[PDB]
Structure formats: C-alpha cells, structure tokens
Amino acid sequence: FSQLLALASLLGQQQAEVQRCREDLQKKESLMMETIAKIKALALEHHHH
Amino acid sequence: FSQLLALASLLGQQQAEVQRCREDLQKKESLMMETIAKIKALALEHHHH
Amino acid sequence: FSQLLALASLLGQQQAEVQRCREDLQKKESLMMETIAKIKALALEH
Amino acid sequence: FSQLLALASLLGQQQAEVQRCREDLQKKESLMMETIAKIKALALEH
C-alpha cells in the first residue's frame, strides 16, 4: 500500500532492534559495576586487615 | 591511613557519579523511544485513515 | 590479592564487551533516525 | 501531520540530550578506570 506502511514498518522493526541492544547493554553495564563494587570492597577489607 | 583508602574512597565516589549519570541517561533514552513510538503510531493511524 | 587482580582482568573484558555493544547500539540508532527522516520528509509534503 | 512534525523536532532535541549525556558518561567511566588502574598497580606489588 502506501509508502508510510513501508517506513513505519521498517521503523517498528528498527526500534525493536534498538530496544533489543539497549537491554542487552544495560545487562552488560550492570555486571560491570558489580565487578567494580567487588574490587572496591576488597581494597577496603584489605586496608582494614 | 593507607593509600588503598584514598583510591578505594575515590573509586567509590567516582562509581557513585558513573551510576548517577547512567540512571539519568536511561531516563533520557526511555523518553526518546516513547517519542519514536508515538511517531510510528501516527504514521500507522494515518495510512489507515 | 589473588582475587582483586582476577576481577581486574575480568573487568577489562566486560568493559570491552560493553564498549563493543555501545558501538553497535549507535549504528542501530543511526539507522532508525534515517527512517524517521524519510518519514519526516514525507510529512512535510502535506 | 501537525503532531508528527512536532514530535520530529522534539525527537531531535532528546537525541542530542542523550548524545550529550552519553558523552559525559564516557568521560566519567574513563576516570573511574584510571583509579582502578592505580588500585591494580598497587595490588601487583604484593
């Protein structure tokens, strides 16, 4: 049908993949901080002996 | 006291600001998609007349 | 200090994985905006 | 098409705001890693 359909369908398909990578990223970023938090806790538990 | 304290305190202070910007960002990104979703819904509601 | 040096090596790999996925997300957002430009250009002719 | 062109202009501003905040987050992560390097270097001497 209209050219709108094609674009709006492409847009909906591309936003699905943007939101897909954005949640996978937020998972990878969350694990990064968890490791950073363990590092900081270890240097604290070490200075405190 | 030890140099660990200074670094581990700096680290904890810098991770606080990293996690601060990361949540503000996730708020700005979430609003972006909401606008994109409204755009796509409008081109669909238009082709469908 | 066995554990800290190990988490340091793991942290490097995750940061790279994050930087990689951050790069891909940029390319996908850029593709999405181009479709929105083609939508905007269409809406300007009405 | 009154509304769509308006959301298009708003979308541009938000994307810039997002790109700006994305840039700042990178500078802060880079500062955080440098402190972790100074921690790693210390842990290597033990």
Side-chain angles (χ1 to χ4, degrees), chain A residues 1-44 46-49, chain B residues 1-44 46-49, chain C residues 1-19 21-25 28-45, chain D residues 1-19 21-25 28-45:
Chain A
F1 266 151
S2 67
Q3 169 83 359
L4 266 43
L5 177 63
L7 297 168
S9 190
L10 181 62
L11 170 64
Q13 215 63 15
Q14 328 208 257
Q15 71 154 348
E17 189 142 89
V18 163
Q19 206 77 288
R20 214 208 320 295
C21 208
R22 191 173 259 141
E23 281 178 25
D24 189 28
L25 181 48
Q26 292 186 358
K27 215 123 61 173
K28 304 172 164 309
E29 295 194 305
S30 171
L31 297 187
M32 180 171 174
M33 307 301 302
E34 290 183 10
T35 303
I36 276 171
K38 285 189 202 184
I39 298 185
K40 168 204 160 184
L42 272 178
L44 292 185
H46 196 280
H47 150 266
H48 289 339
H49 281 147
Chain B
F1 266 151
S2 67
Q3 169 83 359
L4 266 43
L5 177 63
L7 297 168
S9 190
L10 181 62
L11 170 64
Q13 215 63 15
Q14 328 208 257
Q15 71 154 348
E17 189 142 89
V18 163
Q19 206 77 288
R20 214 208 320 295
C21 208
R22 191 173 259 141
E23 281 178 25
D24 189 28
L25 181 48
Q26 292 186 358
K27 215 123 61 173
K28 304 172 164 309
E29 295 194 305
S30 171
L31 297 187
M32 180 171 174
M33 307 301 302
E34 290 183 10
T35 303
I36 276 171
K38 285 189 202 184
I39 298 185
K40 168 204 160 184
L42 272 178
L44 292 185
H46 196 280
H47 150 266
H48 289 339
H49 281 147
Chain C
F1 266 152
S2 297
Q3 218 162 322
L4 189 131
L5 290 175
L7 302 184
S9 284
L10 172 66
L11 179 62
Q13 184 210 277
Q14 323 209 100
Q15 186 173 355
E17 286 175 4
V18 161
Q19 218 72 31
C21 183
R22 281 214 260 262
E23 280 169 13
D24 270 301
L25 173 70
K28 303 166 177 292
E29 278 191 6
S30 189
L31 264 168
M32 183 174 54
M33 301 304 306
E34 288 171 24
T35 306
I36 287 176
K38 282 184 294 183
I39 295 175
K40 182 166 78 73
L42 194 300
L44 284 177
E45 313 160 353
Chain D
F1 266 152
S2 297
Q3 218 162 322
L4 189 131
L5 290 175
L7 302 184
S9 284
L10 172 66
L11 179 62
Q13 184 210 277
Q14 323 209 100
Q15 186 173 355
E17 286 175 4
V18 161
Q19 218 72 31
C21 183
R22 281 214 260 262
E23 280 169 13
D24 270 301
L25 173 70
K28 303 166 177 292
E29 278 191 6
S30 189
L31 264 168
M32 183 174 54
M33 301 304 306
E34 288 171 24
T35 306
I36 287 176
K38 282 184 294 183
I39 295 175
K40 182 166 78 73
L42 194 300
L44 284 177
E45 313 160 353

